[PDB]
Design a binder for these strands. Structure first.
Ligand SMILES: [Mg+2]
Ligand SMILES: [Mg+2]
Ligand SMILES: [Mg+2]
Ligand SMILES: [Mg+2]
Ligand SMILES: [Mg+2]
Ligand SMILES: [Mg+2]
Ligand SMILES: [Mg+2]
Ligand SMILES: [Mg+2]
Ligand SMILES: [Zn+2]
Ligand SMILES: [Zn+2]
Lengths: 83, 150, 53, 98, 24, 70, 102, 91, 53
RNA sequence: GUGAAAUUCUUGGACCGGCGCAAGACGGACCAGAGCGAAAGCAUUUGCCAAGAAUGUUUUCAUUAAUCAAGAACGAAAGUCGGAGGUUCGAAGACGAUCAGAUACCGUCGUAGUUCCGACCAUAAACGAUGCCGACCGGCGAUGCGGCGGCGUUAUUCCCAUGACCCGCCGGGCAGCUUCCGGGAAACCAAAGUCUUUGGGUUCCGGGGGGAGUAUGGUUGCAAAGCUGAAACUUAAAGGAAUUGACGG
């Protein structure tokens, strides 16, 4: 196609493109509210965290670092930050 | 591509367009500065300080929230490392490779990697002496560099 | 064995003979050549292990 | 991993804590009762090692047998001389759990 | 000739030449 | 077969063998005819198995790296 | 002129492929260059299957197979007619010849 | 200043005995007269006393080693083999 | 004795194949071979209980 | 053993079959237009030791970079030196055949070598006969690694994770098919394209065929040889890609 609209690509292909090859760079990661069961406090955790995140009120782990995304422990809740 | 490898990878970090601090970040500039001070006392290099702060405390960019970079903050407080982090790690790797090589004399691959690492060390040292981070007469001696790292 | 598979062979070395009977005991076993060669095929990985016990 | 961890912790004991390098000063610190960790190179003479271990048993302080030698312990301390025995008065870096 | 055998012939001739010159 | 019959042997297990080793693994022209003749001469046939010596790896095969030039 | 794009061998991202000996003449051939034929042949001839089965002591005895992998240098392959020369256009296909099941 | 191009320690032999023999004896003489690091006291004072005998100046430790080197590769492999056989002999 | 009678049906290979399914599926799993390396002194009573009762 | 033979081994039991023992090589099939490595090259298991690409990253430094005379490391095989080892194969050599001759091709034996450790040498059709870094310019289906997202099937368990498949997306690779992108003398090449519409940066290097990679000088090497490297003279072509024919044991 010779008349592709480069100025206004739809969010489908905008998301499917690589982070750097987008029109404006967009990180694919995010921050999440994590809720450990048996605890009241809420932890702000990076999605792609490289470190074992621990509760301060309890000696329990919230995520385990992996290749791309930290795997949250089972029974822990999480929600997005400001989309 | 890579300096000393035939790799042309693209894995990087896409810093977001919004330079503003997120609204849910309750932490203030002095609080983040205190956290950096405590981590540096515990002995973390600035890369590790940034990684810990992003992973656990929810701060996206220390420069965005405080206005100064992590190494700037450390140097202002006066507890920055004498050697730069990357040069220290390169010298660490060179010392480790030399320690392996003095036991494995037939590891010509290790000799080749050692040559590459030392070339990187000398180029980075030239840059740091140009920027006057390092003393003008600072020289990397392979024999004496063992006591500088680890 | 009455109704077992046929691709398995046993060595059965003889230790003692009494009268007109030689008496054997286990010495080893092996798969047959045709079975072993038929099992090996392309586009697949085979894992081989050995242990002294 | 333990050896690199102890080397890093030793490096951070240097430049940030109070220590003392050497046999005579180590014994002096132990019998003053202000030595919290005594590190011995495996190159150490057996009689000296046994005596320092007995002193540490009397003083209720820990002894770590560095998996190096006196040259490598000096290097881990960051010095250009061999150290065969050393004592940490206070770590400053949680080498010694409170 | 084959180029490799011309190379070999040249090498033989060069050894002979070196020997002759060394004899002086 | 006739010697075995007069010595009182009626059935035969079979072990076919080629040259083996680092040399050829295909049985020669005589295996088929020998086994068929044993079958047709009245001898009963039991198990049949290849016992060609197969190296897990062998010494260098003779012939040089340019082979047998013919 | 370059006769084949792949240079007559399957080596693409390698420096060195270990050699094998031609089963016909014992010539060292690169393993990826040699012509390989995996022959799975009945251990007895189809002319003699009936005689063997009749002389068998067993009733439902399935005759064993013979699994031989053959490696050829291209000289012995062409001489033995396992491969043939092809036209310039016909050299470009890699589909093996049909098995001819009927 | 550098005094010899290649003979080094065998310059004391002059033009005698043959270049290949001098080259052969050069490495042996260097390792013979070298001072090794003592594995007991850590100092670089372990030197040869007689053939096969290596004495340290500081700790006065004497070791039975090789003729020209402090230890031979044969003896090192032997020590490793004996350790392996001992740990296999016991359990 | 009860090693031989349990490798007669290749129970060892069957349980190996069952165990490995959580790593990568396997289908043709056998104890391909076993060879005797040493033997204990040839107790005739043990040989006779192996043969008879 | 061969096309056929013969040299050779054999009633002294050769070959064959069985059981053992020893030694040194070699790691089949799995093994692929699959992977890794700067290339050379790298394939039995397990452990140790450092190293690495790619991927992931809202980590850190902040221009630290690209190519690179001189110089430096590695560099198949063969070859050289010293020490072990020497099963097989096998330059030289011997013999048997073949032949008009046969110093060969074929066969029997067999030295150096081939194996290991240490030191040299620095050459290969060391090839993709194709410099590196960067951007742009078609389509398609695969494959390897990493990551991300989804119907389902499967493994345990009570469920999700996690493996194995299935369908996709992204990045970096090894490649493949196809195309009037374009280029080219063409073969062909998605690079060998974006070149008379000629300029992204930079290194090496060619100037008709021979003489000649020769002579000489220098330099390296234990040697073999490596690097650098002419001229006199001679010649009208030598070459490349395709077409038609002729010919092919
Ligand atoms: Mg021919
Ligand atoms: Mg041609
Ligand atoms: Mg090559
Ligand atoms: Mg070599
Ligand atoms: Mg030798
Ligand atoms: Mg021979
Ligand atoms: Mg350029
Ligand atoms: Mg010219
Ligand atoms: Zn052939
Ligand atoms: Zn000493």
């Amino acid at each position: 196609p010779l008349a592709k609209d480069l100025l206004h690509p739809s969010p489908e292909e905008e998301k499917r493109k690589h982070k750097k090859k987008r029109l404006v760079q967009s990180p694919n990661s995010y921050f999440m509210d994590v809720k450990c069961p048996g605890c009241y406090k809420i932890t702000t955790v990076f999605s792609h965290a490289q470190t074992v995140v621990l509760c301060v009120g309890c000696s329990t782990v919230l995520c385990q670092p992996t290749g791309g995304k930290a795997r949250l422990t089972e029974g822990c809740s999480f929600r997005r930050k400001q989309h | 591509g890579r300096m000393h490898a035939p790799g042309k990878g693209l894995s990087q970090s896409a810093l977001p367009y919004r330079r503003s601090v997120p609204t849910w970040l309750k932490l203030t500039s002095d609080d983040v500065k205190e956290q950096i001070y405590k981590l540096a006392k515990k002995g973390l290099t600035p890369s590790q300080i940034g990684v810990i702060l992003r992973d656990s405390h929810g701060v996206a960019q220390v420069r965005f929230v405080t206005g100064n970079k992590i190494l700037r903050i450390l140097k202002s407080k006066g507890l920055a490392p004498d050697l730069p982090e990357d040069l220290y790690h390169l010298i660490k790797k060179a010392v480790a490779v030399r320690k392996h090589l003095e036991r494995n004399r037939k590891d010509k691959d290790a000799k080749f990697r050692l040559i590459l690492i030392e070339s990187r060390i000398h180029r980075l040292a030239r840059y740091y002496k140009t920027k006057r981070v390092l003393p003008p007469n600072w020289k990397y001696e392979s024999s004496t560099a063992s006591a500088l790292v680890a | 064995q009455n109704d077992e598979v046929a691709f398995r062979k046993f060595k059965l070395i003889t230790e003692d003979v009494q009268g007109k009977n030689c008496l054997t005991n286990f010495h080893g076993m092996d798969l047959t050549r045709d079975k072993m060669c038929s099992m090996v095929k392309k586009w697949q990985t085979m894992i081989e292990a050995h242990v002294d016990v | 991993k333990s050896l690199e961890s102890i080397n890093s912790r030793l490096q951070l004991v240097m430049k940030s804590g109070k220590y003392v390098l050497g046999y005579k000063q180590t014994l002096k610190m132990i019998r003053q009762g202000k030595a919290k960790l005594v590190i011995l190179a495996n190159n150490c003479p057996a009689l000296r090692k046994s005596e320092i271990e007995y002193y540490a048993m009397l003083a209720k302080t820990g002894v770590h047998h560095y998996s190096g030698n006196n040259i490598e312990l000096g290097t881990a301390c960051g010095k250009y001389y061999r150290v065969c025995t050393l004592a940490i008065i206070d770590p400053g870096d949680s080498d010694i759990i409170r | 000739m084959r180029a490799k055998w011309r190379k070999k012939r040249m090498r033989r001739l060069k050894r002979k030449r070196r020997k002759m010159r060394q004899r002086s | 077969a006739q010697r075995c019959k007069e010595l009182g042997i009626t059935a035969l297990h079979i072990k076919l063998r080629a040259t083996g080793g680092n040399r050829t693994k295909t049985p020669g022209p005589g295996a088929q005819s020998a086994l068929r003749a044993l079958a047709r001469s009245g001898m009963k046939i039991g198990r049949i198995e290849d016992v060609t010596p197969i190296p897990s790896d062998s010494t260098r095969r003779k012939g040089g790296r340019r082979g047998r030039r013919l | 002129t370059k006769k084949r794009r792949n240079n007559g061998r399957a080596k693409k991202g390698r420096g060195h492929v270990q050699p094998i000996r031609c089963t016909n003449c014992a010539r060292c051939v690169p393993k990826d260059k040699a012509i390989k034929k995996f022959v799975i042949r009945n251990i007895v001839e189809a002319a003699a299957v009936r005689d063997i089965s009749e002389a068998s002591v067993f009733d439902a005895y399935v005759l064993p197979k013979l699994y031989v992998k053959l490696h050829y240098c291209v000289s012995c392959a062409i001489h033995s007619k396992v491969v043939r020369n092809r036209s310039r256009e016909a050299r470009k296909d890699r589909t093996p010849p049909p098995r001819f099941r009927p | 200043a550098k005094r010899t191009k290649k003979v080094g320690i065998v310059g004391k032999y002059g033009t005698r005995y043959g270049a290949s023999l001098r080259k052969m004896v050069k490495k042996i003489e260097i390792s013979q007269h070298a001072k090794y690091t003592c594995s007991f006291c850590g100092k670089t004072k372990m030197k040869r006393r007689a053939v096969g005998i290596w004495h340290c100046g500081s700790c006065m430790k004497t070791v039975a080693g090789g003729a020209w080197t402090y230890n031979t590769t044969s003896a090192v492999t032997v020590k490793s083999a004996i350790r392996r056989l001992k740990e296999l002999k016991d359990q | 004795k009860e090693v031989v009678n349990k490798l007669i049906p290749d129970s060892i290979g069957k349980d190996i194949e069952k165990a490995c399914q959580s790593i990568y599926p396997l289908h043709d799993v056998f104890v391909r071979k076993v060879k005797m390396l040493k033997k204990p002194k040839f107790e005739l009573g043990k040989l006779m209980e192996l043969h008879g009762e």
